[PDB]
Structures are given as structure tokens and as C-alpha cells.
Write an enzyme that holds these catalytic residues in place. Sequence first.
Site, PDB file in Angstrom:
ATOM      1  CG  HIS A   1      -5.523   6.178 -39.923  1.00  0.00           C
ATOM      2  ND1 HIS A   1      -5.291   7.431 -40.468  1.00  0.00           N
ATOM      3  CD2 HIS A   1      -5.809   5.365 -40.974  1.00  0.00           C
ATOM      4  CE1 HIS A   1      -5.437   7.380 -41.786  1.00  0.00           C
ATOM      5  NE2 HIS A   1      -5.776   6.136 -42.123  1.00  0.00           N
TER       6      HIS A   1
ATOM      7  CG  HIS B   1      -9.808   8.427 -40.829  1.00  0.00           C
ATOM      8  ND1 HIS B   1      -8.951   7.358 -40.615  1.00  0.00           N
ATOM      9  CD2 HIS B   1     -10.460   8.167 -41.997  1.00  0.00           C
ATOM     10  CE1 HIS B   1      -9.109   6.474 -41.585  1.00  0.00           C
ATOM     11  NE2 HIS B   1     -10.046   6.925 -42.422  1.00  0.00           N
TER      12      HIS B   1
ATOM     13  CG  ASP C   1     -11.042   1.991 -32.328  1.00  0.00           C
ATOM     14  OD1 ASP C   1     -10.318   2.574 -31.484  1.00  0.00           O
ATOM     15  OD2 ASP C   1     -10.889   2.062 -33.611  1.00  0.00           O
ATOM     16  CG  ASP C   2     -13.896   3.378 -36.113  1.00  0.00           C
ATOM     17  OD1 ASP C   2     -12.651   3.352 -35.897  1.00  0.00           O
ATOM     18  OD2 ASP C   2     -14.426   2.818 -37.107  1.00  0.00           O
TER      19      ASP C   2
ATOM     20  CB  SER D   1      -2.396   3.385 -44.870  1.00  0.00           C
ATOM     21  OG  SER D   1      -3.162   2.286 -45.365  1.00  0.00           O
ATOM     22  CB  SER D   2      -6.012   0.565 -41.815  1.00  0.00           C
ATOM     23  OG  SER D   2      -6.428   0.261 -43.146  1.00  0.00           O
ATOM     24  NE  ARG D   3      -5.258  -0.900 -48.804  1.00  0.00           N
ATOM     25  CZ  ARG D   3      -5.392  -0.744 -50.127  1.00  0.00           C
ATOM     26  NH1 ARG D   3      -4.358  -0.401 -50.879  1.00  0.00           N
ATOM     27  NH2 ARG D   3      -6.575  -0.934 -50.716  1.00  0.00           N
TER      28      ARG D   3
ATOM     29  CD  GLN E   1      -9.497   6.456 -33.052  1.00  0.00           C
ATOM     30  OE1 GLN E   1      -8.679   7.300 -33.451  1.00  0.00           O
ATOM     31  NE2 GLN E   1      -9.689   5.324 -33.644  1.00  0.00           N
TER      32      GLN E   1
ATOM     33  CE  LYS F   1      -2.284   6.622 -48.798  1.00  0.00           C
ATOM     34  NZ  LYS F   1      -3.375   5.607 -48.488  1.00  0.00           N
TER      35      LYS F   1
ATOM     36  CG  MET G   1     -14.809   3.834 -46.380  1.00  0.00           C
ATOM     37  SD  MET G   1     -14.446   2.823 -47.814  1.00  0.00           S
ATOM     38  CE  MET G   1     -12.687   3.128 -47.861  1.00  0.00           C
TER      39      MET G   1
HETATM   40  C1  LIG Z   1      -2.797   9.540 -44.538  1.00  0.00           C
HETATM   41  C2  LIG Z   1      -4.024  10.409 -44.422  1.00  0.00           C
HETATM   42  N1  LIG Z   1      -3.862  11.717 -44.059  1.00  0.00           N
HETATM   43  N2  LIG Z   1      -5.107  12.227 -44.022  1.00  0.00           N
HETATM   44  C3  LIG Z   1      -5.489  13.671 -43.674  1.00  0.00           C
HETATM   45  C4  LIG Z   1      -5.980  11.284 -44.372  1.00  0.00           C
HETATM   46  S1  LIG Z   1      -7.793  11.091 -44.598  1.00  0.00           S
HETATM   47  C5  LIG Z   1      -7.548   9.404 -45.026  1.00  0.00           C
HETATM   48  C6  LIG Z   1      -8.611   8.676 -45.336  1.00  0.00           C
HETATM   49  O1  LIG Z   1      -8.519   7.471 -45.715  1.00  0.00           O
HETATM   50  O2  LIG Z   1      -9.718   9.261 -45.265  1.00  0.00           O
HETATM   51  C7  LIG Z   1      -6.257   9.058 -45.020  1.00  0.00           C
HETATM   52  C8  LIG Z   1      -5.357  10.084 -44.626  1.00  0.00           C
END
Ligand SMILES: Cc1nn(C)c2sc(C(=O)O)cc12
Lengths: 275, 287
Positions: free
Chosen positions: A43, A46, A75-76, A183-185, A79, A147, A39
Site C-alpha cells: 500500500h 510501502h 498486484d505487488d 494498513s491493510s487491516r 506496483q 508506524k 511482507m
Molecule cells: C502506514 C505506513 N507508513 N509507512 C511509510 C509505512 S511502511 C509499512 C509497512 O508495513 O512496512 C507501513 C507504513
Amino acid sequence: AIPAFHPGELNVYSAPGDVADVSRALRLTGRRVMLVPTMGALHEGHLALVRAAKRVPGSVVVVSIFVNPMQTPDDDLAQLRAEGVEIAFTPTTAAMYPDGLRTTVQPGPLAAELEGGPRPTHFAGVLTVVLKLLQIVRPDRVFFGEKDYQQLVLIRQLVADFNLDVAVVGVPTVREADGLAMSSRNRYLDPAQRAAAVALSAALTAAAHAATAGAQAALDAARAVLDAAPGVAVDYLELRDIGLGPMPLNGSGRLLVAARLGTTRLLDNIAIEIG
Amino acid sequence: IPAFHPGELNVYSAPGDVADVSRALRLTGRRVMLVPTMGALHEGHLALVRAAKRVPGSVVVVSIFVNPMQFGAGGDLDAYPRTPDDDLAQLRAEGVEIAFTPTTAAMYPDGLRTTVQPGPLAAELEGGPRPTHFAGVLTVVLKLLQIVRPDRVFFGEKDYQQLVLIRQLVADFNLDVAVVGVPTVREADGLAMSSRNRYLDPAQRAAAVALSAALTAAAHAATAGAQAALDAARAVLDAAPGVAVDYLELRDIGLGPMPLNGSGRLLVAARLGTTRLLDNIAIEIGT
Ligand SMILES: Cc1nn(C)c2sc(C(=O)O)cc12
Ligand SMILES: Cc1nn(C)c2sc(C(=O)O)cc12
Ligand SMILES: Cc1nn(C)c2sc(C(=O)O)cc12
């Protein structure tokens, strides 16, 4: 005519038909098509999905970026270019849902448990969009993080139940230095919250080591760690078998936790071997 | 892969067997055509088979599976006609090279778990009193499409609402198959082919011509508008001994949330004794 595709560059497509035609053309050329659904707001977690996909010999990597209405762009993309990804698929909501919400996927009853408590239609949304991406791209392998473990298990149910021929690959959670799952959170946590949040992963690794003394010991050790943290409202802490059925009396399982810190919900889980 | 003999009928029960054969054939250039059926084959089914055969370089897969998920009741599943010997014989006569005859266990090893939820069309017409029927149908059809991965899949216009729902499945899940609708095959008097016509006694078979007669009367009446077309069909149905109509509806061609313009479909369902018969026809309103 096949859409333009430049090998070794990041080729961005926003139309499902375009990415479908390029993927099919690449498959005919002797590439293995790997799909990494995201989505956006990428980070390192991903990127671990991306790197796992890239190591398959012959791979072409397709990263979709789509915010599901139903569960920076620049940005995405930068990356992904830095990772050597050759295809990004960036559709609009209307390209994904040109007839609106119509035929959907109904998950089995696992979707009502755990994460499905606060969000009882979330997984129907996820499975609908995952199904659509699988049909658009027709990858040989699709990559998801561990996760979101319940999501991963439900995806495997989708694949088994609809006889999909793709291989689902789970990729281990990437973690900050103290164990907190990426996590972005996480950035929304204030300093006291961010210090308390390490209790999730600390509880789970305590439980995995305690598990030589059995299931109750593993659960009690995790509960004690969470009880040592202030401002951590645990929504659940459950030991299940690896496919999220009832935990068997020994052998392999999975321990899942979710909690709220302020207004931020965090999840984690870990492999558990009982005894 | 298992064995495949061209110009012969090869019967596979295992999903993995037909999937591996299908993928191997596609890889050598043949286009794979799928005709999903519930068995009890009649000339209506044979018309789908023949349409599939005429696609050049095609290999034809006919699946035969009485799908328990699209039955509720009340004994409907146990009562569905099963004539496996004749079915395979018919397929051999038609030069079909693949029959796929999976077991219930092979299709539903985990029971009902993830399923297809159709859109709101599934709660109308045939689905009004059978609210889970089309979810059954779409679930089984998606599984067959994934198993076989055909280039084209063939369905009858007879079950028109089913066909429209299968085009919605295909569009909504971005399936890489083309859906081919095949026009209804009719007895000499007009009665639509159906594996339920065997349940009409001589009197009921004679009475049952009223459905096709009503619909063709309406299609011709339709130069005078929708009311004329519907009232012609209703009159013919009203003149028919022992036909009890369950619905007679004129809708847009996609049966969806849009009004009738020039092109419509008139659908009927009626009961003759315990036998429920369906039929439908294209309608062009006025000019
Ligand atoms: C933390 C985290 N480790 N990895 C492989 C992933 S993939 C992911 C995601 O939201 O797709 C979060 C995370
Ligand atoms: C640190 C840490 N936290 N968790 C939940 C895990 S799992 C794991 C591992 O090596 O599998 C390391 C960690
Ligand atoms: C005879 C007959 N009955 N019906 C409903 C139809 S539709 C049709 C046709 O040839 O298009 C013929 C007939």
C-alpha cells in the site's frame, strides 16, 4: 556467472544466492543498494519506503516480499514496476529456512514490552529475518516505516549490537485523509469502527500539541480523546524516550498507542517534545 | 582511515579502525582473512594463521579478545591466561599484518542486549552444563565477522562443536564468509595443543596422552564397528591414572539430529585435577 539483470526493468529473483550475486555485482558497478523489506500486500505506506530509497543518487532498489512464518503477488509486482523498482526478492519459506529454525536472534528486553506483551516471540522472528535479508542483499541503507516504531528501535539495536554497517532509515507514517495510519487491516473495520479508529491519531496529535504544558498534560489529552471513542479497547498508551527507555523529564520523546477494535489491532505513535 | 603499514604488524583496538582498514584493503583487491582468538597463542593458533597466510593476496587479521559473554562461573574469566606481549611477538614472527585487540567497552557498550541464540546443539556436549556458553561464542564471532568482513574465517578442529556451531551461524544467517576448519596441532606424543595444557603438572601431563591415545586407538578399532571403537577408547581412558572422563561420544560429523552412518566424530572431555581437556577425531566405521 552473475544472474541476468536488465537495467530499468523489474528483475525478480526468488533464490537468495541469485539476489546476493546481482546485488554484489551492482555494488561493484557503482550503485548504492537500497533494501525495502516488506511482507507484500503493498500500500502507499510501502511505496513511501520505495520512494525514499529511489531518491538516493545512484540507488538500485531491492524490495523483498516475504511472509515470515516466524513473526496478490502479481498486484505487488505491478506496483513495484510502476515505481521503477529494479529488483524484487521473493523467496519461499524453505529458501529462507533450508535448515529449519535453528540459529536465531534473541532481542534485548525491549522486545518483551509493548507489542511483545501479546506476542512475546514476534520480534525475535522479525530481527532474525531482517538480519538474514541484510546479509543476503548487503544494502548500503535499509528502509523501515515509523508506524512500527518499536520494531524500528529494535532494528537499530540489532544494527548497533552486531556491528552491522548498514544505515537504517525510518520513514514517516503515511496516513489517510483523517489521520488514520495506512494498513491493510483498516479495510476490516466496519463503518462505526472506522470512524472510532481516527481516535488513535487524533489522540496522538492532541498530545503532541498539549505537550507544551508538560508530560502529564500530553498523556491526559491523549487519554481523553481515546475515552471519547466507543469500541476502542486501549492496550497501552505510553510516553517513552526516543529509544523507548523511560521518558526524561523534558525534551524528546515518543508516544505510542495500541488498541483493539472488534478483532482488529491498530497501532500508532508520534514524536513528542516536552515543554 | 587510520594508518596501515604493509609487511608490518598494525595493532588496532577501535572496531571502527579495523573496519575501515579492512574495507579499504578489500577495495584494493586484497582478500581479508580473519583468525579469531582469545590470546594465549600457541602453535595451534599459529597453524590457523599459516593457513590464512597461504591464501593468495590475503591480508591476515588476527583478533585477540577474551570474551566475557562465553564465561559463566566461578572465576573462569579472571583465570583465563593473558600473555599479550608474547601474542603480538608471535604474530610479528608470522608476518601477520593486522592484530585487532578491542576493549570490553568497545565490544559491549550496552552490555548484553541483542544476542545470538544457537540451535539445540549448543545445549549438548560442552553446552550441557554451560547452557549460555555457545550463545556467548556465536555472539562475539558474529560481531567480529561484521566488524572485519573477511572473505574467510579460520577455526580449529580442536574445538569441534564450536566449529560446527559456527558453520550453523554462517549458514543460518546467510553470512558471506567461508568457514575453514584447521586440523588439530599435536605435541609429539599426540596431546592436542591447548591454552589449558599449561595447567597440567608433570604427572597430569604424562597422564593426558590418554585422550589422544584413546581416540587414535578407537579410529583404528573402528574397522570392527562402533562398539569396538568406543570400547577401545574407554579401555585406554580406564587404564589412565587420574583421568576423569566427563563424556566420550561418537556422533555424526555434524553432531546434529542424525544417526551415525559411515563417518563419525568421536569426542572426549576429561578432567585432570581441575584442568578440563577436550579432544576429538574423525572416525570411519567399518568399510
Ligand atoms: C502506514 C505506513 N507508513 N509507512 C511509510 C509505512 S511502511 C509499512 C509497512 O508495513 O512496512 C507501513 C507504513
Ligand atoms: C494527522 C496525524 N496523525 N499523527 C499521529 C500525525 S504525525 C503528523 C505529522 O505531521 O508529523 C501528522 C499526524
Ligand atoms: C597422534 C594423534 N592423536 N590423534 C587424536 C590424532 S588425529 C591424527 C591425524 O594425523 O589425523 C593424529 C593423531
